[PDB]
Amino acid sequence: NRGVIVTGGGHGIGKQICLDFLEAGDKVCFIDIDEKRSADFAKERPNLFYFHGDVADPLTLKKFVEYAMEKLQRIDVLVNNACRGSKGILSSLLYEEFDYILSVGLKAPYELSRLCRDELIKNKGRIINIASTRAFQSEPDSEAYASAKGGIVALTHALAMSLGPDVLVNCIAPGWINVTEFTQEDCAAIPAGKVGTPKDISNMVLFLCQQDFITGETIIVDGGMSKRMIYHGDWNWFYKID
Amino acid sequence: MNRGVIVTGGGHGIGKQICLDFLEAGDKVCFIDIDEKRSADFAKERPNLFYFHGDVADPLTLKKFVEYAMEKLQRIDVLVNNACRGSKGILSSLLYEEFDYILSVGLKAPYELSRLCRDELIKNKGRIINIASTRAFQSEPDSEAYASAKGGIVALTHALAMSLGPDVLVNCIAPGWINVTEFTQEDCAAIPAGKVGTPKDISNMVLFLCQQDFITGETIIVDGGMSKRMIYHGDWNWFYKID
Amino acid sequence: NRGVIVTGGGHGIGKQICLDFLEAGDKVCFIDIDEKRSADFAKERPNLFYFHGDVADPLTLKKFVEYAMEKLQRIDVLVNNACRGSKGILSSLLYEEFDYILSVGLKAPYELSRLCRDELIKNKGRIINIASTRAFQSEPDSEAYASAKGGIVALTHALAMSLGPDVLVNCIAPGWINVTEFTQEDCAAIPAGKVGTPKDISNMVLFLCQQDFITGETIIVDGGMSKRMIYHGDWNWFYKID
Amino acid sequence: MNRGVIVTGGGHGIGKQICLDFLEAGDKVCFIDIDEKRSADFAKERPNLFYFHGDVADPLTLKKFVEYAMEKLQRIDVLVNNACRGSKGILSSLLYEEFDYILSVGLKAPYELSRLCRDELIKNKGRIINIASTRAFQSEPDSEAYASAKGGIVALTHALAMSLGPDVLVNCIAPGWINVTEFTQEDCAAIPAGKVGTPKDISNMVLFLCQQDFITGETIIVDGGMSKRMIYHGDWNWFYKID
Ligand code: NA
Ligand code: NA
Ligand code: NA
Ligand code: NA
């Protein structure tokens, strides 16, 4: 019986989150940059509404929220999900492209939260932000993605402290989620022994929305990878110089 | 049967609710607890709930408990390490032996029960859930013993996860203020979520984690947002008073 | 003997960092938005050069780096410091103003690092980012500041992983630093029993620049405040409903 | 005299270098260490350096050590808790008593020495520095005992800081790979900072922290960036090999 808005809803983790809310009995409105896949996803699913647009554009965010209000009539849950990867300093990623990554991954979650503020407060709703374990550890050439994801982890506790007790706000930080065959080493290198699936994330989204004593938190869902201490030559790991 | 579940501190509070939740889920549960009367009462006329009276501080008792559990459950799928005992610390000049006792119940017992159950949990592709506290990460004065045990169990969690993966997944929940026994308007309002926690908040998370297969090594804070609230005297409704 | 560039150098923490590097024997070029105070700071200090401009503007960042290269002839250390506070969601801080806070506090550190990349690599230099304990805990209405500071903490490890081993990159997260009389309660509430000073931060900046086995790290310098567990009615703390 | 400094594990490695650094700073240093020969040699013909032979695992020994230190130093200004002993864990089925012994040296000793020195440190407005490990925060397999002790000492750090502030400030350093005894090209390149750590990297941080007055309760990672490197098999030069 909830109205749920989801960003990045036409594929991967976002798609599975939309499906899981539909299955829970909710109505879902999602925004996504790819019209074809998104229209198809929504087709012949009467409680699933698609809005085509780029979350990088603030005016689009306002029109998206207006559209969702027209279709859902109420907003109980906002899920901020933005998958776009990027390069960084080793690629000399230009200022404008770094900024764009921030627009999609950090400005949009703020602005959608701001647009939906009163409605979520009134409905005693929930905000769920999807980050990444890249907020906390880095591979080389990841500056833009790292910056957006670190920012959304902090934004999560900021929003939680602003909007509590009426709105609870939490973050999930996925590791490697298959959104598209893997080698034996690919799977065995992860402590949990498998690659993640969008359902591992969506199960956590739905669970967190039903809790009432968790707010401000970021939960890591990465099969234990970030907790594995790795030194060259020890416990099956090796570094190669090119 | 479904799962065989062992729980420490099962006769009261959080441990009691975790036991009940696993029973409702269809499992068989064996718990250890230091208080015979309350625990025997809890298990009475509940055929899938078995009580073992003992102190987890004693390693011989831990071995006897696991043996008892295997007799009653015939399999062990989930181990829940829960130890509530609070203590004092350096301002109270808490003695060495008393500090050690808190470590025995809060840190040694979870390790030893994991070790005793190792092969069984691996065989059954089971789960270990450790209950810590937000006191692992921030402190009030005179909390050294509790802090040390809880910080230890948070680290033990990722150690066990790295040792026992992929067959056993191991995670930790760090509760804040959970009501285990009337609160003022300020009591509830001071917590960002605006309520005091309940044992169901924790047990719900235990049962959920046991069903996940891509979370291991993690500690999840369940404290109504309290640890995330920045607090400075005189700002945003908080004030410090000098005695 | 180092060339050091510092942002926000005309006041507060930035000012003290500039002074400490001058005292260490270095040449320092700083950017700052307030011409009068900054020109005065640089006056009759021949190894201290001031560049007036807004770090929010990428073209200004390029001209600043060009100016510093002309005056210093080499860049060994980059210190990213941006003090500007802001409101947040409870004030309904507009998208553009949230973005501006990100420009100064997150885009600028990236872009200056990018502009200085080759020079810092060549000189085996150091980047020091100044964040805040607000990256990790929040008061209400802090979304913009939280987002920028969380982003810079993550940017720190991203840059460290990209630029190691040649450039080491670390972050300091100050708590309450006096940059402008306090009550007995003000001071006693902080576990260390005092309010911080810009020298507490600058001492850490200079120390970190001399280390060679610390990279990617954020060090909290807040007198222990973030580590104090606080519940209403316990250990001398009290919450008041208005 | 200047400061009176007590250091555990002072006869070798990191502890040895910390002792030397305090001596060079003009202080008097008393250390305890389990190896009599190497420690007596270290103290020989260094009048401001005093050695006490003993096992920090023994609480009676800890009390005797502090008494000895007060006799030789006449004041205690700085306590440095350092304990290097590695151990095995659950995959080795490390027994209860051996797990406990690691806790005794790594977690109980720092608490008890802080307690024994409490009034003296408060009077002198002193410092406690705890040496942990990045193994408090991430794990390799079979590390349960070391992880538990190091996680415990990181939490103990903020507990002591909250108890003893504002008079005593208390901080922790978490070293990564420190050479305490020839490395391959891959050994050094795998670390983001491109070198193996040295005991001076740690001692420099100890002496620096003792001089700060607005840092307390904190753990600083000194590991060349290793814990911050995200590593996935097959990407960015790292590979996992199945036995
Ligand atoms: Na539809
Ligand atoms: Na029964
Ligand atoms: Na000048
Ligand atoms: Na001597």
Automatic annotation (TrEMBL), chains B, D:
Pfam families per record: adh_short_C2
InterPro entries linked to this entry: NAD(P)-bd_dom_sf, Sc_DH/Rdtase_CS, SDR_fam
Binding of NAD(+), residues: H12, I14, D33, R38, D55, V56, N82, C84, R85, Y146, K150, I178
A single GO BP: bile acid metabolic process
Gene3D superfamilies: NAD(P)-binding Rossmann-like Domain
Protein keywords: Nucleotide-binding, Oxidoreductase
Molecular function terms from GO: nucleotide binding; oxidoreductase activity, acting on the CH-OH group of donors, NAD or NADP as acceptor; quinone binding
Signal peptide: none
Cited PANTHER family: NAD(P)-BINDING PROTEIN, SHORT-CHAIN DEHYDROGENASES/REDUCTASES FAMILY MEMBER
Family: Belongs to the short-chain dehydrogenases/reductases (SDR) family.
Protein name in the entry: Short-chain dehydrogenase/reductase SDR
Source organism of the structure: Acetivibrio thermocellus (strain ATCC 27405 / DSM 1237 / JCM 9322 / NBRC 103400 / NCIMB 10682 / NRRL B-4536 / VPI 7372)
